[PDB]
Amino acid sequence: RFLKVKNWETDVVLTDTLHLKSTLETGCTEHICMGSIVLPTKDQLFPLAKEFLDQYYSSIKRFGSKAHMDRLEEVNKEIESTSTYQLKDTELIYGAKHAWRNASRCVGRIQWSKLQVFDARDCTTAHGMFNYICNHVKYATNKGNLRSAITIFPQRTDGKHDFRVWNSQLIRYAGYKQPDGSTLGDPANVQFTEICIQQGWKAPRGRFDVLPLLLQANGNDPELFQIPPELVLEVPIRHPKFDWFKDLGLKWYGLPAVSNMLLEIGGLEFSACPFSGWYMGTEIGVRNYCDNSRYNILEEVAKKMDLDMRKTSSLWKDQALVEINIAVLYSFQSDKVTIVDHHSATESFIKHMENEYRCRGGCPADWVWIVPPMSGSITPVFHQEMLNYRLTPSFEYQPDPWNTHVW
Amino acid sequence: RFLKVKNWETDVVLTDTLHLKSTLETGCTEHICMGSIVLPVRTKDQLFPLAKEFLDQYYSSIKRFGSKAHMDRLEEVNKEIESTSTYQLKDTELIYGAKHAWRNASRCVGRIQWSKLQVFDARDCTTAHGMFNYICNHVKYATNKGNLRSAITIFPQRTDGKHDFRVWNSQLIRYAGYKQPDGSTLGDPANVQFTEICIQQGWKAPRGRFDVLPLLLQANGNDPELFQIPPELVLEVPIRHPKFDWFKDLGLKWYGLPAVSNMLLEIGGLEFSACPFSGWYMGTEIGVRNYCDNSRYNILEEVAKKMDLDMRKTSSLWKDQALVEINIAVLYSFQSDKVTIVDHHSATESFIKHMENEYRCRGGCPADWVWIVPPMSGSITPVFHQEMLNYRLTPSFEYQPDPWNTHVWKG
Ligand code: HEM
Ligand code: HEM
Ligand SMILES: Cc1cc(N)nc(CCc2cncc(CCc3cc(C)cc(N)n3)c2)c1
Ligand SMILES: Cc1cc(N)nc(CCc2cncc(CCc3cc(C)cc(N)n3)c2)c1
Ligand SMILES: C[C@H](O)[C@H](O)[C@H]1CNc2nc(N)[nH]c(=O)c2N1
Ligand SMILES: C[C@H](O)[C@H](O)[C@H]1CNc2nc(N)[nH]c(=O)c2N1
Ligand SMILES: [Cl-]
Ligand SMILES: [Cl-]
Ligand SMILES: [Cl-]
Ligand SMILES: [Cl-]
Ligand SMILES: [Zn+2]
Ligand SMILES: [Zn+2]
Ligand SMILES: [Zn+2]
């Protein structure tokens, strides 16, 4: 009921009490751990609202106050009357900051309280959404000195008037199946690209084509918009010692902006809530560039490097991996675009985790996602026991809208 | 019920039914996942059910379920339990049991090899001197002059818990660690406490960087005794690098035989508290963990210094660069000396093949992703993108506390 986590490198032991406030299910049982699985009415709404408002009023040290009770009654009356309720601006900002605070898969949470929240609950059309998103993109990008932000569109009502950004991220590259059988561009985005084409997008059919936004307002059919090219900060990739590296023709965008998740605050559901921070280098250099099902460049790089690729035990893959990741960081740094390396990011997270244990009684964390996808054990998170559990407010997975939507 | 796992690189989806045979608990609940927590005297009543479950599994495996021999064996074991409170495994059941504990070991990436285990039955052993002899034979057999062979030696099972056989070493072969008065450590910091015990017990420590520890062996609940493994039986590999000539002057070496000696083997409810087992190394165990952990030999700085990497900022990835070179050195040195070793790409590729085979033929393969994914270059191995289900099957290997914490000293 009170739980210990140990760091096996430093022998430091921390006590988690926060997990007692956990709410949703993990997918694990006493018989089986699903720790590595990626995806494991009025009546229910009021308890959800109360749980949230209690934590809000507690955070501003006015728990059990008249303003606390009065707000609880107000929301209760509004739910009884309208079947939903509206968050105060202050509650919206608090909720969004805490959904990030509670994101157990995010290594970057030391930043959680600095989030800029853009209230877009007055948005009514896909054109309005496009405007709000361009403004987010420009604010967050900030000419390369990136600032974390979320833009929050109107909440779900009857679930047939949902706001959705159909893209997985605000900025991502198109993927295309070739007559060859190969894939051009990013294979992760093949399905989305075809939907864009079928909705009328004129595709350049290149390796790095920024996708258009496909925006859905008020449950209407989604519309296409091109983000002003000048708002999309991109970085050409070069290496500080290998001059041939630039000839691979690689680039990536500076702004990681997740746009397919659902923000739940106080039982209310924000189905369009694009949010952004800045990259950890491995996300580009390890995942985006080296996953077999992504740009899959390891072979080409190793070849240019003149490595012995006859045997796995020469560690040619591992050598090329490091060099690709060196180049990502170098390129971002030279262009003054915010980026963090995995050593720095994980050190920061351990510091954050100790803060959270000390001031909050715990910090839900998913080791499988927190440990970087390269050089795991030489980062301080590897030896850190973590407890994974679900707190609200939260960011949740949601199905792709093209399965859900009826045209 | 059917449970699905997906591979996110290939989209291949497997279905697990084996989890239905799971019994022991995980540490997890619907409210908390303890997937990254390292650690999350029986009655007759509890014992016969464990026995029956085991023997039903054994007899099914040999295509003799419900046969006269199956029923006769159940009857024989039942009667043995009622009159003696325990029972003895037949040699065939022991072999099967030990093989299955390995097959069921969810943290083991090397399980493709599970059916090839050499089982040494040491259940006739009575003294620490007897244990020493058995352990030397195991070492010599498993080493096989570098052509390593997997093996387990099984000492008498627990009776009342007052007469346990224990190997006090964590591994049969490991290097001493010495805490200096200035707070630094000589040799391996993982073994400081056990080294101190050995010394207190009368070991004359050479006090160098790579001193093979003596065996500390407890037979039949008696106080443990010290023995030195004959040095000619301890195969070691000097570490050098194929291109960097100065790497040898770091003075590094490692032993070839990884042999876990502190775990408990449970078969059919019986508890084998001394069951040392060995295979061969995956290179990253030495190159990543043993050499580069900050609380182990911690060599990353010295190596990167010698490579003249820019060490003023972590974002040059100097640590990652030195890490790869060290791991290249380990594999190169082992291969050059013809001592069995497996790289993490080969080992993980083999594991995924093993795993898919297990799903097909067995209905599943319990696996602990946290341990299976190698400690460097995680996502460029095929296990990273593989969903896994972790659950506990018996026969099994289990953690047991270090014996100096529990031992009642005779004097
Ligand atoms: C400011 C710098 C940030 C850094 C360096 C960072 C880092 C990361 C990384 C490395 C991941 C896992 C990457 C992957 O596996 O795809 C992740 C996941 C995540 N982060 Fe962050 N993050 C940052 C900001 C944010 C912000 C601003 C939010 C929300 C306001 C957020 C919420 C999340 C969520 C919900 C996940 C899991 C997403 C999923 O399941 O797909 N993070 N973060
Ligand atoms: C034959 C070659 C083998 C290879 C390459 C191999 C590989 C490994 C590795 C890399 C680990 C994780 C250990 C760590 O990182 O400290 C491990 C764990 C383990 N293996 Fe193996 N293994 C092999 C053979 C065996 C054998 C013969 C057995 C028993 C008969 C065994 C049973 C186990 C168990 C029980 C664990 C978990 C240990 C713990 O929790 O401390 N393995 N294996
Ligand atoms: C099936 C599935 C489930 C799930 N929960 N998430 C995903 C998307 C995983 C994913 C892939 N690439 C990128 C991201 C974003 C990671 C990310 C997000 C932010 C805000 C900052 C930052 N530095 N990095 C997330 C897929
Ligand atoms: C606290 C704790 C718990 C636990 N379950 N295991 C340990 C020890 C883990 C451990 C540490 N170093 C080494 C090993 C050996 C793993 C190993 C075993 C075998 C047989 C072959 C092979 N290649 N590798 C295991 C510690
Ligand atoms: C806290 C964390 O679970 C712990 O450090 C684990 C992680 N994965 C591991 N994996 C292996 N193979 N060996 C280990 O010792 C560990 N340590
Ligand atoms: C199957 C496995 O859980 C899956 O590949 C996960 C592993 N860890 C990850 N960790 C991060 N940060 N991002 C990911 O996409 C994944 N994928
Ligand atoms: Cl990845
Ligand atoms: Cl991935
Ligand atoms: Cl390690
Ligand atoms: Cl470790
Ligand atoms: Zn779990
Ligand atoms: Zn990946
Ligand atoms: Zn380690």
PDB file of N, CA and C in Angstrom, chain B residues 83-137:
ATOM      1  N   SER B  83       3.751 -40.160   4.330  1.00  0.00           N
ATOM      2  CA  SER B  83       4.553 -40.810   5.353  1.00  0.00           C
ATOM      3  C   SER B  83       5.879 -40.105   5.661  1.00  0.00           C
ATOM      4  N   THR B  84       6.459 -39.400   4.684  1.00  0.00           N
ATOM      5  CA  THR B  84       7.722 -38.668   4.903  1.00  0.00           C
ATOM      6  C   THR B  84       7.621 -37.136   4.848  1.00  0.00           C
ATOM      7  N   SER B  85       6.463 -36.609   4.445  1.00  0.00           N
ATOM      8  CA  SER B  85       6.236 -35.150   4.311  1.00  0.00           C
ATOM      9  C   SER B  85       6.905 -34.482   3.099  1.00  0.00           C
ATOM     10  N   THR B  86       7.636 -35.266   2.312  1.00  0.00           N
ATOM     11  CA  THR B  86       8.287 -34.776   1.107  1.00  0.00           C
ATOM     12  C   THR B  86       8.296 -35.915   0.088  1.00  0.00           C
ATOM     13  N   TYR B  87       9.015 -35.745  -1.018  1.00  0.00           N
ATOM     14  CA  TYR B  87       9.239 -36.864  -1.942  1.00  0.00           C
ATOM     15  C   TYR B  87      10.485 -36.670  -2.789  1.00  0.00           C
ATOM     16  N   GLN B  88      10.948 -37.749  -3.427  1.00  0.00           N
ATOM     17  CA  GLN B  88      12.091 -37.682  -4.356  1.00  0.00           C
ATOM     18  C   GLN B  88      11.647 -37.747  -5.819  1.00  0.00           C
ATOM     19  N   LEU B  89      12.247 -36.887  -6.627  1.00  0.00           N
ATOM     20  CA  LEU B  89      12.054 -36.906  -8.066  1.00  0.00           C
ATOM     21  C   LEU B  89      12.850 -38.052  -8.664  1.00  0.00           C
ATOM     22  N   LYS B  90      12.277 -38.737  -9.650  1.00  0.00           N
ATOM     23  CA  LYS B  90      13.064 -39.624 -10.516  1.00  0.00           C
ATOM     24  C   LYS B  90      14.031 -38.782 -11.350  1.00  0.00           C
ATOM     25  N   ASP B  91      15.128 -39.386 -11.806  1.00  0.00           N
ATOM     26  CA  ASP B  91      16.149 -38.644 -12.574  1.00  0.00           C
ATOM     27  C   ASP B  91      15.518 -37.979 -13.781  1.00  0.00           C
ATOM     28  N   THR B  92      14.587 -38.674 -14.438  1.00  0.00           N
ATOM     29  CA  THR B  92      13.948 -38.158 -15.644  1.00  0.00           C
ATOM     30  C   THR B  92      13.134 -36.898 -15.363  1.00  0.00           C
ATOM     31  N   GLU B  93      12.464 -36.874 -14.207  1.00  0.00           N
ATOM     32  CA  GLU B  93      11.636 -35.746 -13.780  1.00  0.00           C
ATOM     33  C   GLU B  93      12.526 -34.561 -13.396  1.00  0.00           C
ATOM     34  N   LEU B  94      13.675 -34.855 -12.789  1.00  0.00           N
ATOM     35  CA  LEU B  94      14.660 -33.826 -12.437  1.00  0.00           C
ATOM     36  C   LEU B  94      15.156 -33.108 -13.701  1.00  0.00           C
ATOM     37  N   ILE B  95      15.565 -33.890 -14.703  1.00  0.00           N
ATOM     38  CA  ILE B  95      16.085 -33.352 -15.958  1.00  0.00           C
ATOM     39  C   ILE B  95      15.028 -32.462 -16.622  1.00  0.00           C
ATOM     40  N   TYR B  96      13.815 -33.002 -16.738  1.00  0.00           N
ATOM     41  CA  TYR B  96      12.677 -32.315 -17.308  1.00  0.00           C
ATOM     42  C   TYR B  96      12.409 -31.045 -16.531  1.00  0.00           C
ATOM     43  N   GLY B  97      12.377 -31.158 -15.203  1.00  0.00           N
ATOM     44  CA  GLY B  97      12.120 -29.998 -14.350  1.00  0.00           C
ATOM     45  C   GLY B  97      13.112 -28.871 -14.558  1.00  0.00           C
ATOM     46  N   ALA B  98      14.405 -29.216 -14.586  1.00  0.00           N
ATOM     47  CA  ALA B  98      15.476 -28.212 -14.708  1.00  0.00           C
ATOM     48  C   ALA B  98      15.441 -27.514 -16.091  1.00  0.00           C
ATOM     49  N   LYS B  99      15.240 -28.318 -17.135  1.00  0.00           N
ATOM     50  CA  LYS B  99      15.058 -27.829 -18.482  1.00  0.00           C
ATOM     51  C   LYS B  99      13.884 -26.843 -18.534  1.00  0.00           C
ATOM     52  N   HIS B 100      12.787 -27.180 -17.861  1.00  0.00           N
ATOM     53  CA  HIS B 100      11.599 -26.324 -17.903  1.00  0.00           C
ATOM     54  C   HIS B 100      11.715 -25.044 -17.121  1.00  0.00           C
ATOM     55  N   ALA B 101      12.461 -25.077 -16.014  1.00  0.00           N
ATOM     56  CA  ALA B 101      12.684 -23.862 -15.258  1.00  0.00           C
ATOM     57  C   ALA B 101      13.422 -22.868 -16.162  1.00  0.00           C
ATOM     58  N   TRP B 102      14.389 -23.364 -16.943  1.00  0.00           N
ATOM     59  CA  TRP B 102      15.074 -22.499 -17.906  1.00  0.00           C
ATOM     60  C   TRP B 102      14.101 -22.024 -18.994  1.00  0.00           C
ATOM     61  N   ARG B 103      13.336 -22.952 -19.560  1.00  0.00           N
ATOM     62  CA  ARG B 103      12.337 -22.599 -20.585  1.00  0.00           C
ATOM     63  C   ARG B 103      11.378 -21.519 -20.112  1.00  0.00           C
ATOM     64  N   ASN B 104      11.042 -21.570 -18.815  1.00  0.00           N
ATOM     65  CA  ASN B 104      10.067 -20.656 -18.203  1.00  0.00           C
ATOM     66  C   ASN B 104      10.661 -19.353 -17.690  1.00  0.00           C
ATOM     67  N   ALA B 105      11.993 -19.210 -17.770  1.00  0.00           N
ATOM     68  CA  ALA B 105      12.680 -18.052 -17.187  1.00  0.00           C
ATOM     69  C   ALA B 105      12.436 -16.778 -18.036  1.00  0.00           C
ATOM     70  N   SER B 106      11.466 -15.985 -17.625  1.00  0.00           N
ATOM     71  CA  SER B 106      11.011 -14.880 -18.484  1.00  0.00           C
ATOM     72  C   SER B 106      12.076 -13.763 -18.748  1.00  0.00           C
ATOM     73  N   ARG B 107      13.085 -13.656 -17.884  1.00  0.00           N
ATOM     74  CA  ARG B 107      14.136 -12.676 -18.069  1.00  0.00           C
ATOM     75  C   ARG B 107      15.305 -13.161 -18.962  1.00  0.00           C
ATOM     76  N   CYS B 108      15.223 -14.398 -19.476  1.00  0.00           N
ATOM     77  CA  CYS B 108      16.338 -15.004 -20.213  1.00  0.00           C
ATOM     78  C   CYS B 108      16.190 -14.948 -21.719  1.00  0.00           C
ATOM     79  N   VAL B 109      17.099 -14.208 -22.344  1.00  0.00           N
ATOM     80  CA  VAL B 109      17.071 -14.041 -23.784  1.00  0.00           C
ATOM     81  C   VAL B 109      17.674 -15.261 -24.479  1.00  0.00           C
ATOM     82  N   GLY B 110      18.341 -16.132 -23.724  1.00  0.00           N
ATOM     83  CA  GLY B 110      19.083 -17.232 -24.333  1.00  0.00           C
ATOM     84  C   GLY B 110      18.291 -18.531 -24.402  1.00  0.00           C
ATOM     85  N   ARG B 111      16.976 -18.456 -24.209  1.00  0.00           N
ATOM     86  CA  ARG B 111      16.162 -19.681 -24.049  1.00  0.00           C
ATOM     87  C   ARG B 111      15.987 -20.569 -25.289  1.00  0.00           C
ATOM     88  N   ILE B 112      16.425 -20.120 -26.457  1.00  0.00           N
ATOM     89  CA  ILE B 112      16.407 -20.972 -27.622  1.00  0.00           C
ATOM     90  C   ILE B 112      17.184 -22.260 -27.302  1.00  0.00           C
ATOM     91  N   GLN B 113      18.066 -22.172 -26.305  1.00  0.00           N
ATOM     92  CA  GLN B 113      19.002 -23.252 -25.991  1.00  0.00           C
ATOM     93  C   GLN B 113      18.465 -24.240 -24.927  1.00  0.00           C
ATOM     94  N   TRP B 114      17.250 -23.974 -24.440  1.00  0.00           N
ATOM     95  CA  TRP B 114      16.709 -24.600 -23.231  1.00  0.00           C
ATOM     96  C   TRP B 114      16.728 -26.134 -23.217  1.00  0.00           C
ATOM     97  N   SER B 115      16.437 -26.769 -24.348  1.00  0.00           N
ATOM     98  CA  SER B 115      16.400 -28.224 -24.365  1.00  0.00           C
ATOM     99  C   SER B 115      17.805 -28.896 -24.338  1.00  0.00           C
ATOM    100  N   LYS B 116      18.894 -28.126 -24.448  1.00  0.00           N
ATOM    101  CA  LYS B 116      20.258 -28.699 -24.506  1.00  0.00           C
ATOM    102  C   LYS B 116      21.051 -28.719 -23.201  1.00  0.00           C
ATOM    103  N   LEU B 117      20.411 -28.326 -22.117  1.00  0.00           N
ATOM    104  CA  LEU B 117      21.014 -28.336 -20.790  1.00  0.00           C
ATOM    105  C   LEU B 117      21.541 -29.700 -20.300  1.00  0.00           C
ATOM    106  N   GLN B 118      22.803 -29.719 -19.868  1.00  0.00           N
ATOM    107  CA  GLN B 118      23.402 -30.878 -19.238  1.00  0.00           C
ATOM    108  C   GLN B 118      23.087 -30.810 -17.742  1.00  0.00           C
ATOM    109  N   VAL B 119      22.425 -31.839 -17.231  1.00  0.00           N
ATOM    110  CA  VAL B 119      22.005 -31.815 -15.835  1.00  0.00           C
ATOM    111  C   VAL B 119      22.886 -32.761 -15.039  1.00  0.00           C
ATOM    112  N   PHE B 120      23.550 -32.215 -14.027  1.00  0.00           N
ATOM    113  CA  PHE B 120      24.321 -33.020 -13.123  1.00  0.00           C
ATOM    114  C   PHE B 120      23.547 -33.168 -11.839  1.00  0.00           C
ATOM    115  N   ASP B 121      23.265 -34.426 -11.521  1.00  0.00           N
ATOM    116  CA  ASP B 121      22.471 -34.750 -10.340  1.00  0.00           C
ATOM    117  C   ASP B 121      23.415 -34.884  -9.175  1.00  0.00           C
ATOM    118  N   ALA B 122      23.420 -33.903  -8.275  1.00  0.00           N
ATOM    119  CA  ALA B 122      24.286 -33.987  -7.106  1.00  0.00           C
ATOM    120  C   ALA B 122      23.461 -34.239  -5.857  1.00  0.00           C
ATOM    121  N   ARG B 123      22.325 -34.929  -5.999  1.00  0.00           N
ATOM    122  CA  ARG B 123      21.481 -35.146  -4.813  1.00  0.00           C
ATOM    123  C   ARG B 123      22.045 -36.139  -3.788  1.00  0.00           C
ATOM    124  N   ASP B 124      23.107 -36.875  -4.142  1.00  0.00           N
ATOM    125  CA  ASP B 124      23.819 -37.741  -3.179  1.00  0.00           C
ATOM    126  C   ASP B 124      24.888 -36.982  -2.385  1.00  0.00           C
ATOM    127  N   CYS B 125      25.026 -35.683  -2.644  1.00  0.00           N
ATOM    128  CA  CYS B 125      26.107 -34.893  -2.004  1.00  0.00           C
ATOM    129  C   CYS B 125      25.800 -34.673  -0.524  1.00  0.00           C
ATOM    130  N   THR B 126      26.799 -34.776   0.350  1.00  0.00           N
ATOM    131  CA  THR B 126      26.521 -34.563   1.760  1.00  0.00           C
ATOM    132  C   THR B 126      27.377 -33.499   2.459  1.00  0.00           C
ATOM    133  N   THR B 127      28.516 -33.107   1.891  1.00  0.00           N
ATOM    134  CA  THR B 127      29.416 -32.192   2.609  1.00  0.00           C
ATOM    135  C   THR B 127      29.850 -31.079   1.681  1.00  0.00           C
ATOM    136  N   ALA B 128      30.448 -30.035   2.252  1.00  0.00           N
ATOM    137  CA  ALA B 128      30.916 -28.899   1.472  1.00  0.00           C
ATOM    138  C   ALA B 128      32.051 -29.334   0.568  1.00  0.00           C
ATOM    139  N   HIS B 129      32.888 -30.242   1.065  1.00  0.00           N
ATOM    140  CA  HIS B 129      33.936 -30.793   0.233  1.00  0.00           C
ATOM    141  C   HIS B 129      33.300 -31.519  -0.960  1.00  0.00           C
ATOM    142  N   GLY B 130      32.228 -32.268  -0.719  1.00  0.00           N
ATOM    143  CA  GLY B 130      31.517 -32.940  -1.832  1.00  0.00           C
ATOM    144  C   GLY B 130      31.031 -31.902  -2.840  1.00  0.00           C
ATOM    145  N   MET B 131      30.499 -30.791  -2.342  1.00  0.00           N
ATOM    146  CA  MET B 131      29.972 -29.707  -3.201  1.00  0.00           C
ATOM    147  C   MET B 131      31.094 -29.118  -4.071  1.00  0.00           C
ATOM    148  N   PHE B 132      32.253 -28.907  -3.450  1.00  0.00           N
ATOM    149  CA  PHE B 132      33.407 -28.387  -4.172  1.00  0.00           C
ATOM    150  C   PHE B 132      33.776 -29.287  -5.366  1.00  0.00           C
ATOM    151  N   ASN B 133      33.856 -30.587  -5.113  1.00  0.00           N
ATOM    152  CA  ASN B 133      34.174 -31.504  -6.183  1.00  0.00           C
ATOM    153  C   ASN B 133      33.167 -31.419  -7.338  1.00  0.00           C
ATOM    154  N   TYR B 134      31.873 -31.488  -7.017  1.00  0.00           N
ATOM    155  CA  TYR B 134      30.806 -31.356  -8.027  1.00  0.00           C
ATOM    156  C   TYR B 134      30.923 -30.049  -8.838  1.00  0.00           C
ATOM    157  N   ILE B 135      31.243 -28.961  -8.145  1.00  0.00           N
ATOM    158  CA  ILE B 135      31.345 -27.642  -8.786  1.00  0.00           C
ATOM    159  C   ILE B 135      32.576 -27.551  -9.715  1.00  0.00           C
ATOM    160  N   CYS B 136      33.701 -28.106  -9.287  1.00  0.00           N
ATOM    161  CA  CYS B 136      34.860 -28.172 -10.191  1.00  0.00           C
ATOM    162  C   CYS B 136      34.516 -28.942 -11.449  1.00  0.00           C
ATOM    163  N   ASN B 137      33.859 -30.085 -11.292  1.00  0.00           N
ATOM    164  CA  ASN B 137      33.462 -30.901 -12.456  1.00  0.00           C
ATOM    165  C   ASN B 137      32.510 -30.175 -13.389  1.00  0.00           C
TER     166      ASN B 137
END
